[PDB]
Amino acid sequence: MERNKLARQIIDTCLEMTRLGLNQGTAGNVSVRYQDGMLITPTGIPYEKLTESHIVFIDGNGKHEEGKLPSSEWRFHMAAYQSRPDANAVVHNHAVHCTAVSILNRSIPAIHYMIAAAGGNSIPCAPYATFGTRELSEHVALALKNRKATLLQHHGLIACEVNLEKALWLAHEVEVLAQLYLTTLAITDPVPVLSDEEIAVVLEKFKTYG
Amino acid sequence: MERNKLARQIIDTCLEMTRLGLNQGTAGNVSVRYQDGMLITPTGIPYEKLTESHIVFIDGNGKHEEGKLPSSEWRFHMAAYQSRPDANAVVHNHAVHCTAVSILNRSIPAIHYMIAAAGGNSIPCAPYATFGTRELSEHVALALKNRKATLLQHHGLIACEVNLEKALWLAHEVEVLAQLYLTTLAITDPVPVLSDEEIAVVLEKFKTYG
Amino acid sequence: MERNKLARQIIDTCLEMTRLGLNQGTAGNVSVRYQDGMLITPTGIPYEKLTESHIVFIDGNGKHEEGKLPSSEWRFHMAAYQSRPDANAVVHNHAVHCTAVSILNRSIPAIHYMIAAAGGNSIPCAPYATFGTRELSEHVALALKNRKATLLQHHGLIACEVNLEKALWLAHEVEVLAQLYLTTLAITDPVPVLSDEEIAVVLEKFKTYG
Amino acid sequence: MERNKLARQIIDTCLEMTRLGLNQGTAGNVSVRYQDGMLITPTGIPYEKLTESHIVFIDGNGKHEEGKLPSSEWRFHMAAYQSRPDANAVVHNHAVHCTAVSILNRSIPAIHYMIAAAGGNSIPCAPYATFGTRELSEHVALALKNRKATLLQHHGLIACEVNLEKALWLAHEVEVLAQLYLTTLAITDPVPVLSDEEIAVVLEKFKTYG
Ligand SMILES: [Co+2]
Ligand SMILES: [Co+2]
Ligand SMILES: [Co+2]
Ligand SMILES: [Co+2]
Numbered sequence: 001m002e003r004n005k006l007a008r009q010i011i012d013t014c015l016e017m018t019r020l021g022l023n024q025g026t027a028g029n030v031s032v033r034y035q036d037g038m039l040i041t042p043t044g045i046p047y048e049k050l051t052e053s054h055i056v057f058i059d060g061n062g063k064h065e066e067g068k069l070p071s072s073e074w075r076f077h078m079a080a081y082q083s084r085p086d087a088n089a090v091v092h093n094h095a096v097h098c099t100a101v102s103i104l105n106r107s108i109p110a111i112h113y114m115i116a117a118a119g120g121n122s123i124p125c126a127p128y129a130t131f132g133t134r135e136l137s138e139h140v141a142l143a144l145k146n147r148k149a150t151l152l153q154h155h156g157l158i159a160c161e162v163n164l165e166k167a168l169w170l171a172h173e174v175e176v177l178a179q180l181y182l183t184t185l186a187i188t189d190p191v192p193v194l195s196d197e198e199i200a201v202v203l204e205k206f207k208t209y210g
Numbered sequence: 211m212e213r214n215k216l217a218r219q220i221i222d223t224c225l226e227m228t229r230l231g232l233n234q235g236t237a238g239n240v241s242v243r244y245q246d247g248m249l250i251t252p253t254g255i256p257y258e259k260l261t262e263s264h265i266v267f268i269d270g271n272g273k274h275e276e277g278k279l280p281s282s283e284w285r286f287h288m289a290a291y292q293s294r295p296d297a298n299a300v301v302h303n304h305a306v307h308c309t310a311v312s313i314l315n316r317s318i319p320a321i322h323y324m325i326a327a328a329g330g331n332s333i334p335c336a337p338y339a340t341f342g343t344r345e346l347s348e349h350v351a352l353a354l355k356n357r358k359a360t361l362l363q364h365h366g367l368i369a370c371e372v373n374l375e376k377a378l379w380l381a382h383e384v385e386v387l388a389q390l391y392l393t394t395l396a397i398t399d400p401v402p403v404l405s406d407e408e409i410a411v412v413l414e415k416f417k418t419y420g
Numbered sequence: 421m422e423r424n425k426l427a428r429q430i431i432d433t434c435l436e437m438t439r440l441g442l443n444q445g446t447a448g449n450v451s452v453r454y455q456d457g458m459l460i461t462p463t464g465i466p467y468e469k470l471t472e473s474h475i476v477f478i479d480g481n482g483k484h485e486e487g488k489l490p491s492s493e494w495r496f497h498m499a500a501y502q503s504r505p506d507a508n509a510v511v512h513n514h515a516v517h518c519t520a521v522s523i524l525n526r527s528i529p530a531i532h533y534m535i536a537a538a539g540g541n542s543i544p545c546a547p548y549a550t551f552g553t554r555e556l557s558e559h560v561a562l563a564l565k566n567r568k569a570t571l572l573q574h575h576g577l578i579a580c581e582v583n584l585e586k587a588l589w590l591a592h593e594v595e596v597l598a599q600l601y602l603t604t605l606a607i608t609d610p611v612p613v614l615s616d617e618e619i620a621v622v623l624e625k626f627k628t629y630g
Numbered sequence: 631m632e633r634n635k636l637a638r639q640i641i642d643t644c645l646e647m648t649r650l651g652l653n654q655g656t657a658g659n660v661s662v663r664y665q666d667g668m669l670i671t672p673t674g675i676p677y678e679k680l681t682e683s684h685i686v687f688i689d690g691n692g693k694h695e696e697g698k699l700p701s702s703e704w705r706f707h708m709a710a711y712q713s714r715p716d717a718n719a720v721v722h723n724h725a726v727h728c729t730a731v732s733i734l735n736r737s738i739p740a741i742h743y744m745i746a747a748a749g750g751n752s753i754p755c756a757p758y759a760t761f762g763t764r765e766l767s768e769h770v771a772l773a774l775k776n777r778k779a780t781l782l783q784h785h786g787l788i789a790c791e792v793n794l795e796k797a798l799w800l801a802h803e804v805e806v807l808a809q810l811y812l813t814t815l816a817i818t819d820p821v822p823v824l825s826d827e828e829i830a831v832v833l834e835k836f837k838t839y840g
Contacts (some may be wrong), residue, residue, distance in 0.1 A: 244585050321574065323575065386514075390523060
């Protein structure tokens with residue numbers, strides 16, 4: 001839990017996120033909870049030019065390290081941390097499938113049992129607001145109250161977890177769910193879904209096993 | 211046929227499965243028939259952290275090696291082995307295209323002659339049941355009676371063969387067939403198919419040649 | 421133009437074909453014109469296990485090297501060579517997009533000016549016949565009379581050129597055209613096309629430049 | 631700003647463009663503003679065979695280096711430079727998604743806030759004209775007057791920026807926007823969009839921040 005070791009992980013996540021195809025238009029940003037604020041990726045630096053020294057610390061008051069510019073989307077990383085105390089890492093991206101569903105402003109219903117990984121029977125879509133604004137931050141905080149991931153209308157996705165590895169994994173899983181929903185929707189509307197009781201059993205089962 | 215050599219192959223299949231794009235949401239599991247039970251991948255370990263020592267042995271009674279947790283989906287790997295005696299390896303995954311067709315709960319009809327590789331004129335879809343349950347196991351055993359691969363409703367795919375290489379190959383082929391069917395279905399419903407007689411000739415021909 | 425040097429190229433094409441995503445379900449086969457027949461890939465050997473010694477020679481009478489099994493689809497490689505004297509290499513595959521269009525049994529019309537690379541204002545689709553048969557061979561020979569590539573109904577694609585590099589390039593280009601057509605067709609039917617006169621000018625222009 | 635250093639960058643862009651999946655059918659061409667004309671990729675040489683010596687200089691009169699053949703599409707690279715004085719690099723390709731939208735001859739409306747990166751509330755589609763002609767050049771110059779990227783009907787995409795890195799980045803971003811639009815269009819027509827005022831705020835915000 002040394003800063004430089006947290007800085008590397010953040011960087012490895014950016015690289016890996018790219019490897020998985022979630023980092024298109026190189027618009028993602030990643031952060032972790034640290035001290036009284038967070039460590040986040042900087043604005044204006046393509047992932048492959050990133051070194052541990054580029055990682056920016058932002059305290060709990062919204063004040064950042066001198067001489068360093070944090071991601072232009074840092075504000076909702078702070079909203080996520082304040083909304084979900086258990087969240088230790090946040091991954092945001094503009095993955096294509098998640099984004100297309102968010103353009104239709106639809107939530108992703110229970111078309112697959114893995115939807116329980118985000119905490120319930122759906123992946124919500126928070127209403128649109130200009131990036132970097134406090135109003136966008138509010139919509140995000142409200143959607144994450146009972147879910148670990150949310151689509152953001154005409155924008156992309158935010159997923160949070162207890163560490164970077166799980167957060168990355170969740171984000172990747174929502175992208176798959178997103179592609180599954182668009183694919184079936186083009187054939188039939190609405191898409192068949194699993195019932196609320198059936199999702200209740202899977203949730204209980206995930207609580208049991210891990 | 212030494213355990214450690216079987217353990218490596220299992221691992222190479224996981225890696226290769228990932229390379230082919232079948233391992234999204236890192237949800238797959240692979241096993242081989244061994245002694246009176248099987249060797250299978252463990253639960254809770256991302257494929258790249260896998261070493262031969264992580265591979266778990268489960269006997270014919272459903273009892274596993276002490277201190278090791280087998281895949282959460284092991285039960286249907288055992289059902290596959292007991293349903294198809296000739297099966298020596300099983301590959302399961304949540305490949306996107308196969309899954310979307312399974313969400314529509316449709317079987318894949320004869321839109322291409324390679325559909326004969328699974329044993330007939332279709333790839334069935336077994337009804338949904340909670341993962342890890344005996345009821346899911348039953349539906350699987352019944353679908354594999356006359357086919358080597360089956361879709362699992364709102365879940366994914368199970369393919370079995372005489373060795374890991376062929377099982378992996380079959381799984382990959384069903385994914386292609388799955389993508390071909392979704393693509394055409396979005397344009398026309400129903401999708402033109404080859405007749406039962408025509409599939410009868412290809413099957414005979416595959417019996418002849420190999 | 422030594423056999424072993426032709427054998428390597430064939431192998432590099434298989435690898436590269438795979439790299440481009442045309443070799444799914446590992447069903448492709450590649451050949452070149454050699455002496456009085458051709459050199460072709462063997463049946464039953466996954467591309468990465470291929471060595472120059474696995475390449476099989478088939479004379480003009482349809483008789484192959486002793487102890488070696490040529491691709492199960494060799495017959496139409498011979499039909500292509502006898503139909504188009506100028507053809508020196510043939511590439512066949514079951515690329516997904518080309519195959520989906522072939523399942524709809526539609527020819528690809530002039531939706532893009534690069535369609536002129538195959539010789540006219542379309543990529544035809546030859547009617548279906550069991551693989552490896554003389555009747556399939558006839559349909560292929562007839563479609564290649566005025567085009568360098570053709571879709572094969574419920575099967576895949578055959579593209580021929582003056583060398584392996586161009587043949588591979590053409591095959592790749594038809595796959596792109598195929599994906600472009602399916603994508604637009606799902607939105608609008610029929611898809612807008614360029615006129616015959618406009619394709620006449622591009623053809624003349626390609627004759628001029630190269 | 632030495633020619634050989636500009637030549638390498640051009641080459642790295644071709645490689646990277648390919649890596650991103652924009653270079654299908656190997657039809658792209660890239661140039662930079664240099665002296666009184668430009669440096670551009672040559673015609674007839676697959677990207678991996680490219681060396682700095684293959685890069686061709688074309689002066690402001692349309693006259694090129696002796697013994698070297700520039701891209702067959704150089705003319706609109708010159709039109710782009712003369713239309714947008716601030717443009718220092720041009721990237722052209724036949725990316726699949728951009729091309730499909732261009733086949734429908736539709737402009738890409740404001741379905742995502744990143745559309746502001748091209749300069750306004752849309753990505754236009756310039757009418758079709760035979761490649762390499764002065765009439766095609768006119769349509770391009772006119773579309774780039776108020777935008778940095780444009781689709782070209784039944785053809786592909788042209789994106790310009792202040793350096794190769796940003797031009798490549800823009801091209802990649804339009805491809806993502808293109809895929810987002812086709813995906814949603816197959817489900818609903820028309821696709822919901824952000825208002826002109828909302829795009830006005832994002833533009834102002836990008837002016838502010840960078
Ligand atoms: Co964002
Ligand atoms: Co499963
Ligand atoms: Co074939
Ligand atoms: Co062009």
